[PDB]
Each structure stands twice: as structure tokens, then as C-alpha cells.
Amino acid sequence: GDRINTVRGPITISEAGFTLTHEHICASSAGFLRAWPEFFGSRKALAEKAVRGLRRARAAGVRTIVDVSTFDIGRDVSLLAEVSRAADVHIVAATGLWFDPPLSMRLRSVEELTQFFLREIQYGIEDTGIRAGIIKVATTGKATPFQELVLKAAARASLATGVPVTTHTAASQRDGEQQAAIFESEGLSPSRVCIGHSDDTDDLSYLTALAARGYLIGLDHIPHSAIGLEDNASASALLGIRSWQTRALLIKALIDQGYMKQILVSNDWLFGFSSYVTNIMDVMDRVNPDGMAFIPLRVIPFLREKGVPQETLAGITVTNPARFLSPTLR
Amino acid sequence: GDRINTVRGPITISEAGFTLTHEHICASSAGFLRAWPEFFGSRKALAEKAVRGLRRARAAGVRTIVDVSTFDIGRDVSLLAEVSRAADVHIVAATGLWFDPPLSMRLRSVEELTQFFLREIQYGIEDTGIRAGIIKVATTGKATPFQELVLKAAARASLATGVPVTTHTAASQRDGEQQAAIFESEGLSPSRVCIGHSDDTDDLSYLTALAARGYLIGLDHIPHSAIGLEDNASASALLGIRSWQTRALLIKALIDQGYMKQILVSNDWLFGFSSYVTNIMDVMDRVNPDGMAFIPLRVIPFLREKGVPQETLAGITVTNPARFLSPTLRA
Numbered sequence: 199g200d201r202i203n204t205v206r207g208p209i210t211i212s213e214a215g216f217t218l219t220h221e222h223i224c225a226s227s228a229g230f231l232r233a234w235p236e237f238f239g240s241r242k243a244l245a246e247k248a249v250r251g252l253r254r255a256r257a258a259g260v261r262t263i264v265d266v267s268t269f270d271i272g273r274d275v276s277l278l279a280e281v282s283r284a285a286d287v288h289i290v291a292a293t294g295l296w297f298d299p300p301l302s303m304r305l306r307s308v309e310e311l312t313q314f315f316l317r318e319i320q321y322g323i324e325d326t327g328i329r330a331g332i333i334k335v336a337t338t339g340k341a342t343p344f345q346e347l348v349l350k351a352a353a354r355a356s357l358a359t360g361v362p363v364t365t366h367t368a369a370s371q372r373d374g375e376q377q378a379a380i381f382e383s384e385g386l387s388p389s390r391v392c393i394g395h396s397d398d399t400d401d402l403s404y405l406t407a408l409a410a411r412g413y414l415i416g417l418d419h420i421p422h423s424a425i426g427l428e429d430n431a432s433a434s435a436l437l438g439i440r441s442w443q444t445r446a447l448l449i450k451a452l453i454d455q456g457y458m459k460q461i462l463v464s465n466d467w468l469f470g471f472s473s474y475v476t477n478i479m480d481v482m483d484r485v486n487p488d489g490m491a492f493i494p495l496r497v498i499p500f501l502r503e504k505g506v507p508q509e510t511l512a513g514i515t516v517t518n519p520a521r522f523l524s525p526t527l528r
Numbered sequence: 529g530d531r532i533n534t535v536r537g538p539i540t541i542s543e544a545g546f547t548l549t550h551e552h553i554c555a556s557s558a559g560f561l562r563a564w565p566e567f568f569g570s571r572k573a574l575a576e577k578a579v580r581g582l583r584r585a586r587a588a589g590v591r592t593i594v595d596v597s598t599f600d601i602g603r604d605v606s607l608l609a610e611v612s613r614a615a616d617v618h619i620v621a622a623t624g625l626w627f628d629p630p631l632s633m634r635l636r637s638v639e640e641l642t643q644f645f646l647r648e649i650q651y652g653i654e655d656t657g658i659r660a661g662i663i664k665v666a667t668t669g670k671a672t673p674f675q676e677l678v679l680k681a682a683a684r685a686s687l688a689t690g691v692p693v694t695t696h697t698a699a700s701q702r703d704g705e706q707q708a709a710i711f712e713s714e715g716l717s718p719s720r721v722c723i724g725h726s727d728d729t730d731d732l733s734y735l736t737a738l739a740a741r742g743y744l745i746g747l748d749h750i751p752h753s754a755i756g757l758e759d760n761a762s763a764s765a766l767l768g769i770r771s772w773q774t775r776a777l778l779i780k781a782l783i784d785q786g787y788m789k790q791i792l793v794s795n796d797w798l799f800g801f802s803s804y805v806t807n808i809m810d811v812m813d814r815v816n817p818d819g820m821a822f823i824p825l826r827v828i829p830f831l832r833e834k835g836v837p838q839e840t841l842a843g844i845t846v847t848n849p850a851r852f853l854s855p856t857l858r859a
């Protein structure tokens with residue numbers, strides 16, 4: 199594990215730099231952007247907007263983002279490669295399945311799914327040769343039967359390739375606990391795993407208990423807040439009413455309990471969003487005009503001000519991501 | 529309408545010839561064929577198999593098929609164009625939504641869906657300029673709230689463009705009655721609509737009533753007979769025990785009641801099938817090795833043998849599809 203695969207090819211571990219580990223260029227659905235690009239204005243408008251945002255994040259110090267859009271989030275790796283080249287920001291692409299698998303995925307065995315993820319990691323996505331650098335999976339509460347198969351196959355693909363696994367959770371339901379049981383049932387090392395959306399909960403005990411076991415804790419929703427828009431139900435349903443400062447203080451809490459090495463921080467931001475209500479992007483961009491730069495422009499200063507040492511901030515934002523993404527065989 | 533849109537461009541009504549009105553090159557899911565072509569051996573192997581099949585259907589007299597694969601059936605219009613050109617059979621592509629819409633679709637309003645259907649009809653599918661000549665929709669029992677929006681949008685798209693609508697039904701639940709009610713509420717003329725998989729029912733009067741109202745009746749499951757296959761639960765679950773002869777006899781029943789003009793027949797065949805259990809295709813091909821040629825090779829001769837005249841058979845296989853597919857605006 200001395201090389202990370204990006205959408206422009208392999209980079210060395212030290213080239214990754216300041217890394218956002220849970221982002222998206224566009225959250226959509228399989229086939230959707232190519233079938234109905236006008237939903238986003240145009241594919242050109244979407245790309246131009248992504249490049250603007252990536253250029254601003256780059257200005258703020260971001261060197262790499264991990265796009266955790268799976269097949270069923272409508273990942274378009276050709277778009278990723280395009281905006282990565284235009285903005286000069288490294289993008290790591292994902293394989294895996296999120297919670298909108300179509301029938302041709304849903305009906306598949308753990309063995310078939312394992313071959314699919316391996317294809318995307320080892321040989322390349324679609325016909326592009328672009329290899330995924332991470333595996334994304336998801337539950338929303340107790341795993342469905344198919345979701346158990348997805349997590350087992352993600353564990354098998356990770357063991358075979360060294361590529362890490364990262365999760366969507368409903369944190370309020372402590373999904374991370376079931377996810378960890380399943381992964382461990384496959385012999386996967388907890389240090390290969392990031393339990394994501396974990397700042398959606400204030401149950402610190404749930405969080406430290408997982409970190410104690412060696413899991414990475416993805417605090418990737420820091421800017422997600424509907425405060426000031428509580429009368430917009432779709433936004434509050436999506437974003438929650440907890441403030442960004444509250445979410446960021448979980449980072450400090452984890453640090454204070456000794457778990458700085460287990461923390462990964464991100465915005466879970468995006469430049470198009472079709473798998474929710476129309477015009478939701480306009481709401482989100484008003485909520486967080488900084489977009490992906492929110493972590494380096496607002497969160498890191500806030501923590502430093504609350505007394506987090508520069509050294510600890512560099513560890514969380516540079517070191518942990520490098521360790522996590524470096525392909526690492528058991 | 530003087531022209532029907534195909535994956536190779538417009539054709540004249542008379543070029544359509546013998547037409548199968550409900551078929552697939554490949555039944556899959558959006559994005560799936562491009563992300564995981566090895567599920568079908570390879571894209572090349574799938575294309576080759578579809579070409580051989582299309583070539584044998586062409587040999588048996590099939591001039592045109594309507595591939596009723598929607599976005600969420602994983603329609604790959606470039607693949608349709610490639611196999612159309614290689615086999616030299618006309619293929620009409622479809623717009624619409626079947627019963628596996630992803631979130632980005634499921635969350636859309638009737639107005640948005642209407643715009644998406646119109647895009648695929650008037651401007652072209654994806655970035656290809658290939659325009660759909662039909663709109664496929666689906667219910668499986670009482671329409672879900674999303675399926676109502678889909679049916680309304682299909683009706684609005686058909687009214688605006690003249691292109692017909694064709695449906696998947698659970699026939700045993702009389703889906704066609706609610707589908708019709710919805711289409712009529714939008715002022716769509718029944719002669720624009722085919723109520724599909726209708727040979728799945730034994731209720732002749734459910735069928736004759738719709739035909740009387742002016743609906744086309746899609747008898748497109750003729751070869752789907754899971755006969756001698758209860759050893760295989762997903763296959764007999766897929767297919768059924770009713771014989772192909774019994775299903776074909778529904779064509780004769782509609783003819784006998786005076787509805788030959790309202791009948792469309794097809795195989796609902798396919799060369800790949802990822803939206804089901806693995807290796808279902810081997811099972812299907814062993815059951816019906818004629819494939820899309822089953823209609824011209826087995827069904828048409830059987831009907832003639834049962835006394836159905838040549839002109840009537842020409843009417844059903846050539847004249848009805850031509851009338852159906854030819855873009856027709858209301859008054």
C-alpha cells in the first residue's frame with residue numbers, strides 16, 4: 199500500500215495532503231445524469247459549478263477529496279475525471295452500494311457482489327480504467343437482508359485489495375454497531391472501516407465505544423443544519439436542527455477522550471442532488487456557501503480556537519486520511 | 529404521422545411490416561450493462577446473441593420489433609442501434625418508467641416526468657439523438673401514488689406527440705381497468721393505448737370490455753409457459769403453467785368476438801435478463817428456443833390451423849401495429 203488510486207491515476211501517499219474523505223461531485227442515481235442532464239441545467243453547468251467549488255476548496259488548502267458516490271448514487275467517473283483535471287484536485291472514486299440498489303443489484307448473491315466491487319477496484323469502473331480507492335456501503339437502521347450481503351462483500355473486497363470501507367449510517371439508531379458486527383464476522387480489521395455520519399448523534403458513548411475497538415469515526419456532516427429554516431420540513435428532515443458548532447465539538451470530545459487517530463472529518467457536500475426534492479441544492483448552498491471549503495475555512499479554526507493544537511489538526515486532516523486510504527492488506 | 533422513429537432514424541409506415549410490439553434486447557437496470565457487462569459474459573457476447581436472435585426472427589419474417597425497455601429496465605439505446613444495424617431489423621425504442629424507478633425518478637412531479645418523457649420522444653435519448661416511438665409504463669396491482677404520476681405523464685406525453693403508450697399489467701388483478709381510467713382522465717384516446725401482458729388472464733370478458741372501449745390488447749406472453757418446471761420455483765413463478773396454446777386461443781377468442789382490430793401479439797422475449805435470478809436466461813431459452821421467432825413460427829400457423837384467415841393474421845401482425853405506432857394527435 200504505497201499508492202492511492204485517483205480518477206487521474208495512482209498518487210503517492212504524501213501527494214494526498216489535506217483530504218476530505220466523504221464528499222460527492224453529484225448525488226443522483228444510476229444512469230440519471232446521462233439520461234436527464236437538464237435536471238441540473240446541463241451537464242456543462244454542473245461540471246462548471248463543480249470546478250468552481252473544487253477550485254475554491256483547493257484555494258483553502260484541500261488537496262484531495264474522496265467522492266463516495268457508488269453506482270446507485272449515480273456516480274459518473276468520467277465527470278469526476280473531467281472536473282478533477284480542470285480544478286487540479288485529486289479525487290478518489292468509490293465502489294460499493296448505497297441504499298437505492300436497482301433490481302439487477304438487489305437480486306445478487308454475496309459472491310456476485312464481491313466480484314462487482316473487485317471489478318471496480320482492480321480493473322476499473324465501466325470501460326474507463328479508473329479504479330476505485332474506497333468501498334461505500336449503507337444501512338438506515340437495522341440492515342435489510344440485501345444490506346447484510348453488501349457489507350459482507352465489501353469486507354471481502356477490502357480483504358482482497360486493502361482498500362478501505364466507509365459507511366452511511368442512521369447514527370440515531372447506532373447502525374455502526376451492527377455494521378461492525380457484520381464486518382468482524384468476515385474477519386475485517388476495524389482500522390479498515392470508517393463509520394460515517396457519526397456526528398448525527400450526540401451519544402458520545404456509542405462513538406467512543408466504536409473508536410475504542412479501532413473503528414474510524416466519520417464526522418462528515420459538520421455543515422449540515424436547518425437552523426433558521428425549521429419551517430422548511432424537507433430541509434430539516436434532511437439536515438437536522440443541530441448546529442454546526444455542536445457537531446464540531448464532537449470532534450473535540452473524541453480528541454479529549456484520546457481518540458484523535460480514529461477521527462476523519464468532512465462536509466458531505468455536493469454540486470448536484472437529484473435523489474431528493476427539486477431545488478434542494480439552492481437550499482443547501484444558502485445554508486453553506488463555503489461548500490467543501492467549510493472544513494478548512496470554519497471548522498479547523500473553530501477547533502484551534504477551542505484549544506486543539508495545530509499538530510492534532512494536521513493529524514486528523516492529513517495523517518488519518520493517508521493511513522485510511524493507503525491500501526493495507528491484513 | 530407519416531413516419532415511425534426507430535433507432536436508425538424515421539421509417540415510413542409501410543417499412544414497418546410484420547411487427548412484434550412488446551420485446552426486449554436486454555431486461556436490466558439503469559447503468560447496469562455499462563457497469564457490469566461481465567454479468568452477461570460480455571457486452572460483445574450479449575450483442576452477438578441478440579444479433580443471432582434478431583437474424584432468425586428476420587428469417588421468419590419479422591421486420592420490426594418494439595423494444596419496450598425504459599430507462600429503469602436499463603435500456604441501452606446505443607446497443608439497440610448496434611444490433612439493429614447488424615441484424616437489419618427495425619427497432620423502436622421506448623421512453624417511460626417501469627416498476628423499478630430509482631430515487632431521482634421516484635421523487636419527481638407529474639410535470640417533471642412529463643418533461644423527461646418528451647425529451648426522450650422529441651429530442652433524443654441521452655446524447656444520441658435517437659428518439660423513442662413509444663411510452664412504456666407499469667403497475668402491478670393498484671397503482672402506487674408514483675405510478676399514477678407516471679401514467680398521467682405518459683398520457684400527457686402521448687397527447688402532445690401522438691406516440692402510443694403500452695403497459696405492463698398484473699392481468700389477474702385487472703390492472704387495465706385503472707390504467708384506462710387514469711389515461712381517460714387525461715383525455716388520452718384508448719386507440720393510443722395497449723394494455724399489455726393481457727394473455728396472463730383467463731377472464732375473457734375483462735379483455736373484451738377493454739377492447740370494446742377501443743384499447744389495444746397486448747397478448748405478448750404467448751411463449752411464457754412454465755410447463756413441466758415446478759422443479760424450478762422462480763422459473764414457474766416467472767412463467768406459469770397455462771399452455772402457449774391456451775394463451776394463443778385468447779387471440780382467437782378476441783377475433784371471434786369481433787375485435788381483431790384491437791389485438792397486438794408478441795413474445796416479450798429478451799437476450800439478457802439481469803433483473804431476475806441468475807441464469808434465468810438458460811431456463812427461458814430451453815423453454816422457448818425459437819425466441820422472438822416463436823410468434824411467426826409457432827403461433828401464426830397454429831391460429832391458421834384453427835381457422836383464422838390469412839387476411840386477419842396480416843391485419844393483426846402488420847396493420848394493427850402500423851396504426852398503433854404511427855404518431856396520432858387527437859382531433
Ligand SMILES: C[As](C)(=O)[O-]
Nearest residue numbers: 225271296366466
Ligand atoms: C449520497 As448521501 C445523500 O447519503 O451523502
Ligand SMILES: C[As](C)(=O)[O-]
Nearest residue numbers: 555601626696796
Ligand atoms: C421488463 As418485463 C420482465 O416486465 O417484460
Ligand SMILES: [Co+2]
Nearest residue numbers: 365366367395
Ligand atoms: Co450518506
Ligand SMILES: [Co+2]
Nearest residue numbers: 220221222466
Ligand atoms: Co454522502
Ligand SMILES: [Co+2]
Nearest residue numbers: 695696697725
Ligand atoms: Co412487463
Ligand SMILES: [Co+2]
Nearest residue numbers: 550551596796
Ligand atoms: Co416486457
